Structure formats: structure tokens, C-alpha cells
Design a protein around this ligand. Structure first.
Ligand SMILES: Cc1ccc(C(=O)Nc2ccc(CN3CCN(C)CC3)c(C(F)(F)F)c2)cc1C#Cc1cnc2cccnn12
Length: 297
């Protein structure tokens, strides 16, 4: 069934129940920006009282193409619904001004910078420790399991696309238009596209197919970011003809030092060249559940 269909976001309904009075939004600092869009912190009144929210709005430079993208984004978040381990949609202002999408604000920011900020404090096996890492590994697989169950393929899963909020709960997100991928070197020109190659499955790279199983490969690379406390993958190794050659041959990363053995076995299986031998996210959630209990006490 689900291997043969996909949701076309332009074919989803937009319910106007999301529409929010744009004069009840007060904008604050920018959290991230791309050419045509940005994500800004904001205050919203009477949305659920004053509350802090995040807003992804189009810049003045933006074209119909980017507006369409943002409207499709709105439709997908509405379609996905609101869940613990995915960024939650709160509202939108799509007329009478810049088109924008309103979500919850995640108070600890994106996971990659957080891990980097916390690397030096790390308590080997408040500060970070192994159960934090396991908890994040679990919550991301769990969120992805839900995405897969809705037949939603992420395509840019990596630590930079995860946010962290209260109680060290992770929220999968996608900055999309509001990231400056031209000046982010994790995105590499490949044809007529800058792509997150070091995170991508071979079949995606060479064949431009993105599947449930290619997201699992990126999750593997994410695991390596996580247990490497925010290190860039394939250190010292530029994307080029040689890098492509080497992934195709079976070259893979060695375990991060802080990864339990079972976590690295998960990474390795995520990285199988045969998409069909990779675990599903449902399976990963199970294995990590067990690890977390074993690692407790
Ligand atoms: C305002 C805002 C609007 C939208 C989104 C957003 O994540 N959009 C999104 C679009 C698509 C998809 C799924 N597709 C992926 C592509 N794929 C090809 C198809 C399926 C998903 C996903 F979560 F489901 F993954 C999310 C995030 C923010 C934020 C924020 C925020 C909150 N706190 C902080 C603190 C610091 C910085 N930012 N920030």
C-alpha cells in the first residue's frame, strides 16, 4: 500500500480555522533566515493571555513559488496534527500581509547548537549525559515513526532540523525556506540543487529517490551527530567524486566514543546499502526503549 502512494501537499485542504488576527502578533528577534523567508520569535495575544510563539514568514523578496511552498507547509502541519515530538502548529496569517505560519516556541533552540553548547559539560558514563542522548535518540525515532505512519517523508532529517524545548523534549522540524543553504556548507551543490549529501542515502544521491528507508539512513547520520556531541559527519572528508565512490564501496563512519554498542549497531543498520535491510522507525523505537531501561539505575 504505502510504498506506492504519497501525499501531494497541494492536494490537501486548507482549513481557515487556523487563521489568526495578524495584529495580535508582535514580532521579535530573528531565529533564522534564508533568501525568501525567516523564522522570528514573536508574542501572540489570545491565541489559546500573552504567549511566546515562533513565526515563519515570507520576506518581501518572495515570489508566488515560495508562497505556495509555505501554504503547502501549513497544509502538511495541519494534516500531521499536534504531537509531543513534532513542532506544533498554532495558527497562520495568510492574507492582509506577509504570509506566515505560527508554531510553538521551543525554548532551547535547535538541537545541533544545543549539543555544541553542551559538549564540554558532558558527564561520561544541568550537564548532558548518556541518558539525555538516549532520550533524544528515542524521541526523534518516535517522531519519525509518526511521520512515517502518516506517509510523510522528511528528506532533511539532521540535528539542525530538530528543536528542543521544556523538559528536554525534542521536536522534529524543517526550516526549509528560512535556512540559508547557500552559506551552509552541509548543503553541497549536486546538479541544480544544494543538498545535504553527508546525510543522504546512496539511492537518494544517485537516483533522487526519497523513501521511508532513506529517512532511516539520515536518522543513522543523526545518531552519529548526537553521540558525537554535535560533530560534523565524515570529519576531514569533503563531498566530491571520491566521497561518492567511497559510500558506494561500503565506507561508513566508526562509532562515536559516547555511543553505546547497541546504538552504533543501529547506526550501521541504518546505513545498509540495501534499503530493505534497514530498520523501520517503529523497530528503532523498540530497541532504544530497551537501551534506556538497561542504561538506567
Ligand atoms: C515558525 C515555524 C514554522 C514551521 C516550522 C517547521 O518545522 N515546518 C515543517 C515543514 C514541513 C515538515 C514535513 N515535511 C518536510 C519536507 N518533506 C519533503 C515533506 C514533509 C515538518 C515536520 F515537522 F513534520 F518535519 C515541519 C518550524 C517553525 C519554527 C520554529 C522554532 C520554534 N522554536 C524555535 C527556536 C529556534 C528556532 N526556530 N524555532
Amino acid at each position: 500500500g504505502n510504498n506506492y502512494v504519497y501525499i501531494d501537499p497541494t492536494q490537501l485542504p486548507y482549513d481557515h480555522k487556523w487563521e489568526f488576527p495578524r495584529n495580535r502578533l508582535s514580532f521579535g528577534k530573528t531565529l533564522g533566515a534564508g533568501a525568501f523567508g525567516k523564522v522570528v520569535e514573536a508574542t501572540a495575544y489570545g491565541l489559546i493571555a500573552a504567549m511566546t510563539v515562533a513565526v515563519k514568514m515570507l520576506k518581501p523578496s518572495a515570489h508566488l513559488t515560495e508562497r505556495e511552498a509555505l501554504m503547502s507547509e501549513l497544509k502538511v502541519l495541519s494534516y500531521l496534527g499536534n504531537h509531543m515530538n513534532i513542532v506544533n502548529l498554532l495558527g497562520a496569517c495568510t492574507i492582509g500581509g506577509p504570509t506566515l505560519v505560527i508554531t510553538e516556541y521551543c525554548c532551547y533552540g535547535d538541537l545541533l547548537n544545543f549539543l555544541r553548547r553542551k559538549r564540554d559539560s558532558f558527564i561520561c558514563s544541568l550537564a548532558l549525559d548518556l541518558e539525555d542522548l538516549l532520550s533524544f535518540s528515542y524521541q526523534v525515532a518516535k517522531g519519525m515513526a509518526f511521520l512515517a505512519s502518516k506517509n510523510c517523508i522528511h528528506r532533511d532529517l539532521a540535528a539542525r532540523n530538530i528543536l528542543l524545548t521544556h523538559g528536554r523534549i525534542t521536536k522534529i522540524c524543517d526550516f526549509g525556506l528560512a535556512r540559508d543553504i547557500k552559506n551552509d556548507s552541509n548543503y553541497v551543490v549536486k546538479g541544480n540543487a544544494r543538498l545535504p549529501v553527508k546525510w543522504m542515502a546512496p539511492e537518494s544521491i544517485f537516483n533522487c529517490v526519497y523513501t521511508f528507508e532513506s529517512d532511516v539512513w539520515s536518522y543513522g547520520i543523526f545518531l552519529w551527530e548526537l553521540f558525537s556531541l554535535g560533530s560534523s559527519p565524515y570529519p576531514g572528508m569533503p563531498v566530491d567524486s571520491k566521497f561518492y565512490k567511497m559510500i558506494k564501496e561500503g565506507f561508513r563512519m566508526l562509532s562515536p566514543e559516547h555511543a553505546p554498542a547497541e546504538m552504533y549497531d543501529i547506526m550501521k543498520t541504518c546505513w545498509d546499502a540495501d534499503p530493505l535491510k534497514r530498520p523501520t522507525f517503529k523497530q528503532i523505537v523498540q530497541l532504544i526503549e530497551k537501551q534506556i531501561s538497561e542504561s538506567t539505575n
